[PDB]
Amino acid sequence: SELLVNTKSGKVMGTRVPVLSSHISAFLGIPFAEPPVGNMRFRRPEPKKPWSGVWNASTYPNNCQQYVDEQFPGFSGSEMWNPNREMSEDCLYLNIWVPSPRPKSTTVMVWIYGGGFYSGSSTLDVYNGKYLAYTEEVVLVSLSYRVGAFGFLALHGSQEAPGNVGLLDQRMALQWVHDNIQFFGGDPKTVTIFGESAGGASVGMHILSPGSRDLFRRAILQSGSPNCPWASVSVAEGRRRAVELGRNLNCNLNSDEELIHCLREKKPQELIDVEWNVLPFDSIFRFSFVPVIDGEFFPTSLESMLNSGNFKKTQILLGVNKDEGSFFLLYGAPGFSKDSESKISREDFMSGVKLSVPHANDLGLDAVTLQYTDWMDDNNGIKNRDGLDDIVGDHNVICPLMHFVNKYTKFGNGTYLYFFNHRASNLVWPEWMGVIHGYEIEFVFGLPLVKELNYTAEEEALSRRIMHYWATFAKTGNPNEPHSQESKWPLFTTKEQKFIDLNTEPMKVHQRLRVQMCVFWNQFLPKLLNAT
Amino acid sequence: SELLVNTKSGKVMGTRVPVLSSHISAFLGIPFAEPPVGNMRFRRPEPKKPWSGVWNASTYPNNCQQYVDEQFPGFSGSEMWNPNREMSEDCLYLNIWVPSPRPKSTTVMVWIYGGGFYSGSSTLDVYNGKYLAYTEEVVLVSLSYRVGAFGFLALHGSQEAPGNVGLLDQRMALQWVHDNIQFFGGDPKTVTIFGESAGGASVGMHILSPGSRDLFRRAILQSGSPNCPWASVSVAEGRRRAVELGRNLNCNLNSDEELIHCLREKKPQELIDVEWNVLPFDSIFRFSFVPVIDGEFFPTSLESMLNSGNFKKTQILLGVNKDEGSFFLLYGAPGFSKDSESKISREDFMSGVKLSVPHANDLGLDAVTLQYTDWMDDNNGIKNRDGLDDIVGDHNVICPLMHFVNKYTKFGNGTYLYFFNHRASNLVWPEWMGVIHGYEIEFVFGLPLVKELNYTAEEEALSRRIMHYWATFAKTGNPNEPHSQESKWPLFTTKEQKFIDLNTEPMKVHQRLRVQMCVFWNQFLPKLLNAT
């Protein structure tokens, strides 16, 4: 049988699924770990005890316990990102989409979802791997990992809540793929991890982390990098937040044993209810429980590992969207709303930069303001709006990724860099939000191929180009076809620093993506804040 | 007789001088003070003892003792600014050009020359007032004042070298004009002081200084303002430099009496030889002996006088040239030379900003660099050259003047602001130096009217417009004619901040002259340097 696969964990039964008037195989909700429940909340994942009999892998698994956006009830723009399954701590499952007939050993792509380490699901409509598996003849895996306090509460020194266990969840999925993907026709020697947002940051963390490096060949990072300021905290900051969480649930704080015991007695939703009370600043684009720089998962600080070349040397492909900031302003910054142009007064501008750069003294705020204000206009509400949008994207996504790119590229074996700036013609969010954080994903997964979803034809063509770049890169470490009359996406080099626009127009090649601003965010501002 | 004028100081005999195939009267080298010689070196000026008999005012007087540029021997571009008369400490004279026939009471314009308070002469070809007096039917005066150590050595606490005596020289000329210009057909109730560079700074100092305010009605400032960083020093900095000068001449430093006595025994050229040894930094656009903020001439700091409105409220007209910096880079910054394009390497750029901002810590230098570097190019020698040129002009001239304009305008009775950006077609300096510091002067004095000097016709027309703006403004406090089909030069207001380009093209009205950069130089950088 073709839906029956025998693995090292036991036999698995999949389903036949329709895709663009053809079929492929799908193995949904395969467990790669023991359920992290009861005593095991906050602990490292345990490998899944082998089972006898056949595991029914015909439906999606549960999603991990998490915050649910309810700002816009029924609005597909927001709800497309919420859990579409029952939430459970019992959530360590992966899903595999396999071509029909089954290949012998093809390229494998493992998807790691985003959501700021506080949210995310492998089971979302946008993450359905069937279009990509079918179109590009690859085995598509999507894993899951604990998020929020459940995956990132960090009481360093303890084994009951060591920190980073959500990242270890990911690694265990990768270990499982390494060990068992051969039985699905996957090539374990050619597996590409890819993710967006925190998933992109996670991908870069697996590049850095010595314990993860041997488990994949290549990586793609979308709008995310390990050195992003929201992506990690120190062990002491993690400890403060752990304690502060316990303070919010009236827990005993005499010791780590008594704190963790108390946090384990709580129902999951009780923790989720107070998750945002623990942030030490009034901020946006900052999340309560994220990876810690612990000494185990990362031997030293992220920056010295990048400087010294302490990372997996391979090929990477990565990029960013035009308007990464706009989501976080909508949700957390005064003046912005879903149903207006959101012209921003001078006061909401100043309020906005405070929120965007929370550790900045007054001089730091003046420096940002000077950098992003048009002083010819100055009071124009659109320019304030757009300036603020650029501040949030540049600081949190574009400029950290550019720092990573420039430092990876000195020691790596190939970088390809993209800037995705197509506004989808069927987008539900207002025009002011531009090319939004997360909306290249639908092109990478081929949703513009399905007629019922109301994309344009030139959008179908863009998605096909993107799926082909991604898959070819997974396959060979180059997104380009050997022959191909189409224009080459060139390597990003230290010297020339070339990247491409990813849009419906014929490919233009640019240089030095946002250098003026990234010299400000990566060199000048830190030096300024350190000297004060 | 028409060349014979009887004044309160005694009778004066002038000469008939030819001007554009007509005649006017000229009274050259009239003394307004006692010669500051011997015991009187460094002392306040004494009023000129009345003389009997007729003072021959038929030839230019001597120039004040001063540094002589010899970088380019025989080069008219440099030598047009050197003394064209014998140098002498006996130099306190003024020159008066009067229309023929003599008027009864017309507008008076008093010219105060520049030269960084270390140089300058009333007698230069470019400062010949006859063209302006004739064309605009005004009485033109040019005064002189001691420069260098002779006019600005400042041992505060002493009466033998109080400081600022060069500024008092100027005031005594103004007092003399107030008292005696009526006898030349001048209206003492309508006298406009105007100057360029340090003369423009001097004009603004007379606006500020309570003892000078009553002696003129209106002011014009060209490429200079009192709050420029090169235009003044504190009493302690003046004292250090005085002592350091004495140290260079092996003088006794036990006391002020013994130091000043020793500096008086020196021949003038001995002081001039070591004048530049006393600057405490490696800098450009900084001069050794300049006005001191003493408490007498200026009751408090320049900035608090501007903030509190402690100044003469009247009409001012002022402006700047496109490329104020280029002279000072040519003379003092590595990479620049008269006979090349002067493309600047990255090293000469960094060397150049150090020189330009001498009190700046490393963070301050990074801030300037960030502000003026195109990071798309970065290594382009032309862009480095032009960036550096803009740094020197903006920091030393444009942005200080804009601060003055914005602060004067809150309390004043009319501001008119210009940006002069015509490169003269007969200019002798290289193209890279652009519209040079001091080269609007030739238009203000009407040299483009003389055929032999090789200007274009549209340059004659520009000079006629400029002489007319200047004279009309002197006359009424508005550079515009009541009727006139030509476009109005609007008032500079706090709200709209309008100014005009002064060039051969039809008048364009702009707003907010160089605000982006002036927010950097006037707000951000000081705050940055104070916080560190």
Ligand SMILES: *[C@@H]1O[C@H](CO)[C@@H](O[C@@H]2O[C@H](CO)[C@@H](O[C@@H]3O[C@H](CO)[C@@H](O)[C@H](O[C@H]4O[C@H](CO)[C@@H](O)[C@H](O)[C@@H]4O[C@H]4O[C@H](CO)[C@@H](O)[C@H](O)[C@@H]4O)[C@@H]3O)[C@H](O)[C@H]2NC(C)=O)[C@H](O)[C@H]1NC(C)=O
């Ligand atoms: C592809 O493009 C097409 C065309 O642009 C899109 O099709 C449109 O889809 C919308 C809905 O998604 C549809 O609008 C509905 O029309 C119905 C009939 O006129 C209405 O009954 C319905 O109103 C209800 O829902 C609204 C919330 O959106 C409420 O404002 C309203 O009060 C109604 O709410 C009712 O809900 C409950 C439960 O059903 C009921 O008990 C009550 O009566 C209550 O009142 C919508 O307005 C458009 O008409 C569609 N247009 C066309 C031409 O088909 C399509 O969505 C696109 N596809 C994708 C995937 O994007």
Ligand SMILES: *[C@@H]1O[C@H](CO)[C@@H](O[C@@H]2O[C@H](CO)[C@@H](O[C@@H]3O[C@H](CO)[C@@H](O)[C@H](O[C@H]4O[C@H](CO)[C@@H](O)[C@H](O)[C@@H]4O[C@H]4O[C@H](CO)[C@@H](O)[C@H](O)[C@@H]4O)[C@@H]3O)[C@H](O)[C@H]2NC(C)=O)[C@H](O)[C@H]1NC(C)=O
């Ligand atoms: C208006 O425009 C016109 C046209 O552009 C300008 O007229 C030109 O003016 C220059 C001089 O200013 C003149 O050049 C001279 O030509 C002479 C005859 O050919 C030369 O003898 C003279 O050379 C001497 O001076 C040079 C320094 O500039 C030296 O390089 C050279 O070695 C010579 O030096 C001599 O000097 C001493 C003392 O005299 C002598 O003992 C030695 O022999 C020694 O050798 C110049 O090259 C041009 O020819 C003029 N052109 C025309 C067409 O007339 C005019 O200047 C402009 N007017 C203004 C006000 O700007």
Ligand SMILES: C[N+](C)(C)CCCCCCCCCC[N+](C)(C)C
């Ligand atoms: C592409 N994804 C799925 C990754 C991220 C965008 C999903 C919408 C949420 C963005 C707004 C931030 C909300 C901040 N929190 C809830 C803390 C307020």
Ligand SMILES: C[N+](C)(C)CCCCCCCCCC[N+](C)(C)C
């Ligand atoms: C328009 N004027 C007459 C006012 C000023 C320009 C005159 C040429 C001198 C500029 C170069 C500065 C030299 C610096 N010092 C000699 C100190 C080196």
Ligand SMILES: *[C@@H]1O[C@H](CO)[C@@H](O)[C@H](O)[C@H]1NC(C)=O
């Ligand atoms: C697997 O589960 C589905 C739905 O829950 C069910 O319909 C199907 O019968 C199951 N498969 C097997 C082989 O029992």
Ligand SMILES: *[C@@H]1O[C@H](CO)[C@@H](O)[C@H](O)[C@H]1NC(C)=O
């Ligand atoms: C990557 O590695 C291969 C094989 O070691 C080498 O020959 C090739 O030049 C490298 N390419 C890049 C872009 O570094």
Ligand SMILES: *[C@@H]1O[C@H](CO)[C@@H](O)[C@H](O)[C@H]1NC(C)=O
């Ligand atoms: C004034 O001086 C000039 C030149 O020095 C001389 O030629 C002239 O005769 C003098 N005038 C009188 C009235 O003596």
Ligand SMILES: *[C@@H]1O[C@H](CO)[C@@H](O)[C@H](O)[C@H]1NC(C)=O
């Ligand atoms: C200046 O002063 C006059 C008379 O006091 C006044 O009426 C006029 O409006 C003022 N103009 C400006 C520009 O301030």
